[PDB]
Ligand binder design. Structure first.
Ligand SMILES: *[C@@H]1O[C@H](CO)[C@@H](O[C@@H]2O[C@H](CO)[C@@H](O[C@@H]3O[C@H](CO)[C@@H](O)[C@H](O[C@H]4O[C@H](CO)[C@@H](O)[C@H](O)[C@@H]4O)[C@@H]3O)[C@H](O)[C@H]2NC(C)=O)[C@H](O)[C@H]1NC(C)=O
Ligand SMILES: *[C@@H]1O[C@H](CO)[C@@H](O[C@@H]2O[C@H](CO)[C@@H](O[C@@H]3O[C@H](CO)[C@@H](O)[C@H](O[C@H]4O[C@H](CO)[C@@H](O)[C@H](O)[C@@H]4O)[C@@H]3O)[C@H](O)[C@H]2NC(C)=O)[C@H](O)[C@H]1NC(C)=O
Ligand SMILES: *[C@@H]1O[C@H](CO)[C@@H](O[C@@H]2O[C@H](CO)[C@@H](O)[C@H](O)[C@H]2NC(C)=O)[C@H](O)[C@H]1NC(C)=O
Ligand SMILES: *[C@@H]1O[C@H](CO)[C@@H](O[C@@H]2O[C@H](CO)[C@@H](O)[C@H](O)[C@H]2NC(C)=O)[C@H](O)[C@H]1NC(C)=O
Ligand SMILES: *[C@@H]1O[C@H](CO)[C@@H](O[C@@H]2O[C@H](CO)[C@@H](O)[C@H](O)[C@H]2NC(C)=O)[C@H](O)[C@H]1NC(C)=O
Ligand SMILES: *[C@@H]1O[C@H](CO)[C@@H](O[C@@H]2O[C@H](CO)[C@@H](O)[C@H](O)[C@H]2NC(C)=O)[C@H](O)[C@H]1NC(C)=O
Ligand SMILES: *[C@@H]1O[C@H](CO)[C@@H](O[C@@H]2O[C@H](CO)[C@@H](O)[C@H](O)[C@H]2NC(C)=O)[C@H](O)[C@H]1NC(C)=O
Ligand SMILES: *[C@@H]1O[C@H](CO)[C@@H](O[C@@H]2O[C@H](CO)[C@@H](O)[C@H](O)[C@H]2NC(C)=O)[C@H](O)[C@H]1NC(C)=O
Ligand SMILES: *[C@@H]1O[C@H](CO)[C@@H](O[C@@H]2O[C@H](CO)[C@@H](O)[C@H](O)[C@H]2NC(C)=O)[C@H](O)[C@H]1NC(C)=O
Ligand SMILES: *[C@@H]1O[C@H](CO)[C@@H](O[C@@H]2O[C@H](CO)[C@@H](O)[C@H](O)[C@H]2NC(C)=O)[C@H](O)[C@H]1NC(C)=O
Ligand SMILES: *[C@@H]1O[C@H](CO)[C@@H](O)[C@H](O)[C@H]1NC(C)=O
Ligand SMILES: *[C@@H]1O[C@H](CO)[C@@H](O)[C@H](O)[C@H]1NC(C)=O
Ligand SMILES: *[C@@H]1O[C@H](CO)[C@@H](O)[C@H](O)[C@H]1NC(C)=O
Ligand SMILES: *[C@@H]1O[C@H](CO)[C@@H](O)[C@H](O)[C@H]1NC(C)=O
Ligand SMILES: [Ca+2]
Ligand SMILES: [Ca+2]
Ligand SMILES: [Cl-]
Ligand SMILES: [Cl-]
Ligand SMILES: [Zn+2]
Ligand SMILES: [Zn+2]
Ligand SMILES: [Zn+2]
Ligand SMILES: [Zn+2]
Lengths: 696, 696
């Protein structure tokens, strides 16, 4: 039989390992020749594996690279202007790659050039609340200071935006061992910890979903009209550079001014973590100087797009997508995911060669330039937005397959909760101690849901990966899954070797997944989801699971507002309409579910009608006017947090209207905007509910 | 048989006449009790006629009304401040209606209150080119002047916007006999001409598609959050009032300053048409004073929405819609159209009662508050936008059925050209001299197309009626048809009694259509279109007809640009991408047409696929970011002219970027924006073409 079991049994751990080795021997930086060669290889292999067509889709987008003959670095400079200490020009390469060429040195992609000189202020994680504490409570002014911040807790672009708004003239990012050195584990190559010379690369844009900074709204094709740099979306206005903790120790050890306000501000290095500004008395005339010479340049990128045409509904698309570009070797990010996609394509192609076809069309994508702001996925979706809007059933992301070896992690739309529960109950757990038990059982045991008991945790989608354009711009049901570390020990900073030269095939093979069993489990979960989405007669979405979460989010946002009972009285701020809409959604969704079970199974138009209502339900939460000042975040239920792009926020328009509202100087205006966002949310929920009513 | 002939033969001229009489005995002003009573009547009758459901959908929107105890009027005031001449407080009522109550007096809906006093400037039709001529050529400054403009040529809202931007402090609109008195025809009640005491009502908003001024984007339902007046969309900032030509003669006869610049500026009254400013020497100290006391008020309106559920595709909607609210009796506008819709509903209901159902669902709408800015249609479409986006096949408008008695007029999307040609070839001409000939033959003979010979004229959709939200906001294929006057004699100002108290049942029965044969012909054309759209197995749209017009519009916009060859050289302004896209569209559309003819007729999914490609083709021309500063005009091929809302403009984004470009002070920026709009248009055309490619 050609069923899901046939598909699943064809997936092999050993193939995933061979592909991972193959994809991680040389760097595949976006816009470089090596990454175009790899694209051409994947295109040729997907063709051999049996897909119907495999094409490259290219775009010319703004990228950013250090200047090879003028390297970036930071100094301590004395009153004469002698540079008495210099940060490193490169990470020490790992064993056996010390002769690899074209390792891009650590830098912050999209930083402007400059050589600012000044006194340091230490700003902890440079979160919105860190700056509140500095400015409001401690009275420290960052205006014209260079700020130093530890990586972790929030996306680095938000840190840089927050420093810029505080008036900083430069930002230094570093990895603290508190956040990137796990107790009792050795540094690479002897374990999976970050060495003191290790540095995390990463872009520092604030794109808010725009894609290529120069062409928001439209694909960066051959005739595209580009904004000038000064009108580009999302570029930082102050120089930024990342360093490791050996160098950070040298910059921090002399810090003076105020003490850290409390222990949440202290990392693990042997320094006081003083906030500053500037250095202690003896060194008070030394300053810090950055030298940044990176350049932004329009550069061609390439996505690989494979198609496996559907037998029954070829005009319905189920998409499995993940990126291919890496900062260096990409041993975890992204190639642990790309190897998994490669083996999924191979398995589907095996079934195809024997004459099977899925019911719906399956699109496979190897995206480029994800590391530079989701550019490949977003330019392609801009180009194909009309096809995706009217035909896109679901998007499953496929970046890193592992970030730990403890249990499953799934983030997805409520529409996929039931599908995920059911599929995982049919898969074998790879975990020690759960031999012969289901993945569902191990996952539920190790990662209990906060709400439900007997159920596993499934998180909201945030952002910082290639599903953003599909989910929050276009409203296509989306999900992601990988193996992860313990939620109980999770400091939310990323695995220690994230975006460092030490993320290699050996890291994975030696320390994360030597038998490739977690990789195989993730290939079964991602591939299983794609299979069910592309092949189930009725789309495997349960609208009633959205009803349950909508009530939870409505409770949550009401609770936030209720911290201000006096203002809700004064301005007549009612959540009645939103609760009403969520009640209606629950009632209509219950009735639609009854019809979906009871409908005449013989009638295909009835079937295509009800599958269209399921497909367009995520679509209904899109507001074409977008959220305030963020036109590409159009989903009313979920947006990336305005304070941390990685995190999802629910009822984002109402959340942001309420955030810090006690500080607004015109409360009437502020609470008016809260009411406006309540109206928009209640309306959108009711309208989405009405798409599930009988059609006529 | 229940086929189109059965439907068409059931329509009766005599029923349309009875309904028109019934709908025109009392005024049905939006927001009044009389118009709610009529809504309730139509709801009850559509139920009796056999529709499956008939509901009222209500909204609370901003309307505008004179103050009953403080009437509007204009004076000539002498240096003491005695008002030596006053304009009329009402139109003389026609014979037999002199005792009708609640005739709203002439006023400009949405005018602010004020009593500005000043010197007059005469501005011809207050068109963009009229103001260019005054300011640039004649050096007349309108700043702080009251301007007087004759109605005609362009929508009155554009006149008021243009006066406001010239710095006027008030605007007086009047009907010139040059534009509203046909040679040789008597004034009402003895003929169809406008008497000197006649006045044209009408709103003066510039909504640009927004709907209710207080709730742009969202329906004005019970919990809606409303903008304050100062942030409302589209309201004029200077007082405005309309008058007839007896009163206008009194205001104009004393005009001094400059002579009219040429004869295109002179109407037919016995006055010099001097431009001013102010009056001749002896009267130079007399001024003009307005007194406007109308108020804007949120008021409930009611749409009637009837549903005839489809037998095969109930989730596909074909909509026949026209408004019900009138300025006074609405003998032509809108009730000549509403009577036609009433008889169409009756005929469909007859077939339904015998067991027939159309293939697709048919929605019938009686919209409210069209006269106040398309408010009823637009609030409903805002409420139901997700259903309409994913399910709307077509919208046929049904305002006035007649504006003359000469020949057919059709304005529609190219997608409906073939349907209209074919249907009219099967209908009988009602015209004298074409007895036993087809409507197609009479229409082609009397209204030849400028491009084609052997073909009839079919115009672009403009705006100023209830299809605007469906076509230019949501991208649903739309059309309209009515009987019209001779294009050769057409001065484009409207029929003479437009929006006057003299537009009555008698006007129509005595002077326009005594046998109701033109009404019947229009019921056959509108109803015939709805029938074919709701019942044809393959949707009756021909994508190749869009390809032909796209090439015509691309030629036209290129020709405009080519008036500036030096700048196109300097700034490298190329139309190559747009011509390329139009070529591709033509090629793909030709191939799609071959498949549509050759496809396996047995396969319904193949059928639903190809009907979806046809339905979403108009949808593909929507840009979700909208046109510059006009977020509700989202169609890239057609928008209402920025200088005249009634007229359609093709490639509007490129047209406006080119308009008056030789006057822009930064030509580099201006031609940059031209290039941007070329890129957007070429991209949208290519993307729409790609929706017709094979799907996978
Ligand atoms: C959840 O679904 C429910 C039930 O299906 C839906 O209920 C609707 O509630 C609205 C809003 O209250 C009702 O609106 C009323 O409609 C009647 C005519 O049917 C009007 O007379 C009412 O207006 C009067 O009263 C108002 C309130 O006091 C006054 O402000 C006003 O001036 C009038 O005097 C009012 O408009 C509507 O009838 C029901 N519909 C149905 C089918 O029951 C509810 O709105 C849904 N929730 C959301 C968030 O959409
Ligand atoms: C109408 O349809 C046609 C044909 O189907 C479609 O043609 C496409 O044209 C584009 C734009 O010219 C082609 O793009 C080229 O693609 C190749 C790789 O296939 C690139 O090497 C080319 O780039 C080089 O040359 C450029 C131009 O001189 C340089 O600027 C650049 O730096 C590179 O050196 C170029 O990107 C594309 O291959 C074809 N596609 C096909 C299938 O033939 C055309 O674009 C359509 N019109 C519109 C408006 O979409
Ligand atoms: C990764 O695997 C690919 C595919 O097996 C290798 O590319 C092949 O290399 C052989 C021998 O050099 C060529 O003859 C083939 O044409 C290549 N095939 C394709 C599709 O490119 C590649 O060498 C491997 N890379 C590494 C680093 O091992
Ligand atoms: C840090 O790097 C800087 C720049 O390379 C060094 O300063 C330079 O030293 C060279 C060699 O002595 C001089 O010729 C240049 O004039 C100096 N350049 C600048 C910009 O100051 C500096 O010596 C290094 N400091 C340490 C401690 O290694
Ligand atoms: C792979 O799994 C092992 C086993 O759980 C992890 O190591 C254990 O984890 C905790 C530290 O959080 C310790 O208390 C145990 O003592 C560890 N056992 C052993 C044998 O080391 C290991 O951390 C995982 N590898 C990765 C990269 O996460
Ligand atoms: C997940 O599996 C459950 C249990 O099989 C499915 O729920 C059943 O669906 C069948 C088939 O329609 C119904 O007749 C049963 O009554 C359902 N059982 C329960 C407890 O609800 C569910 O539909 C599956 N979810 C998905 C998305 O496929
Ligand atoms: C317009 O026609 C309607 C429907 O025939 C008339 O309304 C009916 O009036 C009768 C007698 O007064 C009532 O008993 C019915 O209940 C009404 N029916 C409905 C559906 O409203 C109405 O009187 C006519 N109006 C005019 C001006 O002639
Ligand atoms: C035009 O109308 C105005 C306002 O009604 C007239 O002026 C008023 O006349 C009455 C009666 O004489 C006075 O009591 C008011 O004081 C006047 N009001 C104002 C605002 O001036 C005026 O007489 C009328 N002019 C003509 C020629 O009929
Ligand atoms: C109804 O049709 C008649 C016949 O065409 C129109 O009157 C004629 O039209 C032109 C004026 O444009 C004259 O040259 C003829 O002499 C007229 N003939 C007659 C008998 O009047 C009439 O204008 C139409 N009615 C309306 C309201 O448009
Ligand atoms: C308008 O009528 C024409 C002529 O009947 C239709 O074109 C024909 O369609 C048939 C049926 O598919 C084809 O086999 C013929 O070859 C077509 N003839 C020509 C000359 O094209 C046309 O499809 C109708 N248009 C609409 C929208 O229904
Ligand atoms: C990089 O720096 C060098 C050497 O100082 C300079 O000549 C060149 O302009 C720079 N390259 C780029 C791409 O900016
Ligand atoms: C911070 O410094 C700058 C001037 O050096 C000033 O404009 C700004 O107001 C200061 N703010 C505070 C709160 O000290
Ligand atoms: C209309 O004018 C009267 C009488 O001068 C005034 O008392 C009333 O306020 C006005 N009515 C409205 C609705 O503005
Ligand atoms: C028109 O009048 C006002 C001042 O009365 C002035 O601001 C404006 O510049 C004038 N413009 C011209 C062109 O005369
Ligand atoms: Ca873009
Ligand atoms: Ca609205
Ligand atoms: Cl992922
Ligand atoms: Cl119309
Ligand atoms: Zn990644
Ligand atoms: Zn990454
Ligand atoms: Zn009308
Ligand atoms: Zn009208």
């Amino acid at each position: 039989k050609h069923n899901m079991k046939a598909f699943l049994d064809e997936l092999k751990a050993e193939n995933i390992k061979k592909f991972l080795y193959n994809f991680t021997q040389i760097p595949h930086l976006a816009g470089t020749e090596q990454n175009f060669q790899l694209a051409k290889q994947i295109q040729s292999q997907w063709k051999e594996f049996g897909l119907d067509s495999v094409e490259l889709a290219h775009y010319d987008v703004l990228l950013s690279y250090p200047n090879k003959t003028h390297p970036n670095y930071i100094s301590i400079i004395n009153e004469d202007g002698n540079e008495i200490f210099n940060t490193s020009l490169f990470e020490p390469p790992p064993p056996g790659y010390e002769n690899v060429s074209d390792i891009v040195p650590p830098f912050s992609a999209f930083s402007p050039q400059g050589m600012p000189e000044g006194d340091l202020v230490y700003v902890n994680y440079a979160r919105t609340e860190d700056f509140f504490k500095l400015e409001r409570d401690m009275k420290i002014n960052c205006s014209g200071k260079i700020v130093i911040a530890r990586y972790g807790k929030v996306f680095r672009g938000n840190k840089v935006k927050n420093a810029q708004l505080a008036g900083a003239k430069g930002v230094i990012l570093y990895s603290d061992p508190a956040d990137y050195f796990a107790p009792g584990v050795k540094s690479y190559p002897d374990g999976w910890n970050l060495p003191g010379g290790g540095v995390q690369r990463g872009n520092i844009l604030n794109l808010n979903g725009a894609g290529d900074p120069l062409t928001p709204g439209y694909p960066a094709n051959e005739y595209a009209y580009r904004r000038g740099i000064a009108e580009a979306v999302g570029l930082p206005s102050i120089p930024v550079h990342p360093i490791g903790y050996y160098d950070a120790q040298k910059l921090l050890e002399k810090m003076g001014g105020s003490a850290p306000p409390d222990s949440s501000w202290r990392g693990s290095l042997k320094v006081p973590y003083n906030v500053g500004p500037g250095f202690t008395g003896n060194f008070s005339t030394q300053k810090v100087k950055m030298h940044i010479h990176s350049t932004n340049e329009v550069t061609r990128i390439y996505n690989v797009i494979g198609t496996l045409r559907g037998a029954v509904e070829p005009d319905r698309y189920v998409i499995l997508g993940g990126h291919r570009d890496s900062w260096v070797f990409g041993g975890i990010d992204p190639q642990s995911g790309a190897a998994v996609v490669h083996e999924i394509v191979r398995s589907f192609g095996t079934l195809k060669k024997e004459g099977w076809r899925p019911r719906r069309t399956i699109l496979f994508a190897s995206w480029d330039a994800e590391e530079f702001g989701l550019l490949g996925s977003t330019e392609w979706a801009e180009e194909n937005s009309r096809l995706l809007q009217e035909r896109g059933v679901a998007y499953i992301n496929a970046d890193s397959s592992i970030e730990g070896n403890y249990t499953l992690r799934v983030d997805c739309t409520p529409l996929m909760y039931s599908l995920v529960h059911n599929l995982t109950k049919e898969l074998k757990s790879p975990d020690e101690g759960f031999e012969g038990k289901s993945l569902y059982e191990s996952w539920t045991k190790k990662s209990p849901s906060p709400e439900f008991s007997g159920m596993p945790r499934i998180s909201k989608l945030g952002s910082g990966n290639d599903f953003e354009v599909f989910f929050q711009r276009l409203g296509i049901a989306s999900g992601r899954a990988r193996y992860t570390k313990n939620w109980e020990t999770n400091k939310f900073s990323g695995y220690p070797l994230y975006h460092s030269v030490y993320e290699t095939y050996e890291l994975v093979e030696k320390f994360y997944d030597p038998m490739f069993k977690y990789h195989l489990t993730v290939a079964q979960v991602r591939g299983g989801m794609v299979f069910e989405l592309a092949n189930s007669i009725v789309l495997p979405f349960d609208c009633r699971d959205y009803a349950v979460v909508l009530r939870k989010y409505a409770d949550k946002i009401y609770s936030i507002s209720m911290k201000h009972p006096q203002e809700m009285k004064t301005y007549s701020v009612s959540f009645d309409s939103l609760f009403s809409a969520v009640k209606n959604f629950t009632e209509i969704a219950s009735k639609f579910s009854e019809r979906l079970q009871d409908f005449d199974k013989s009638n295909p138009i009835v079937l295509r009608m009800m599958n269209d209502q399921l497909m367009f339900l995520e679509r209904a939460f899109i507001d074409p006017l977008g959220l305030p000042d963020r036109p590409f975040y159009r989903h009313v239920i979920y947006a990336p947090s305005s304070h941390n792009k990685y995190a999802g926020e629910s009822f984002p328009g109402i959340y942001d209207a309420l955030f810090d509202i006690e500080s607004k100087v015109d409360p009437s205006k502020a609470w008016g905007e809260v009411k406006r966002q309540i109206y928009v949310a209640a309306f959108t929920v009711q309208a989405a509910a009405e798409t599930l009513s009988e059609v006529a």
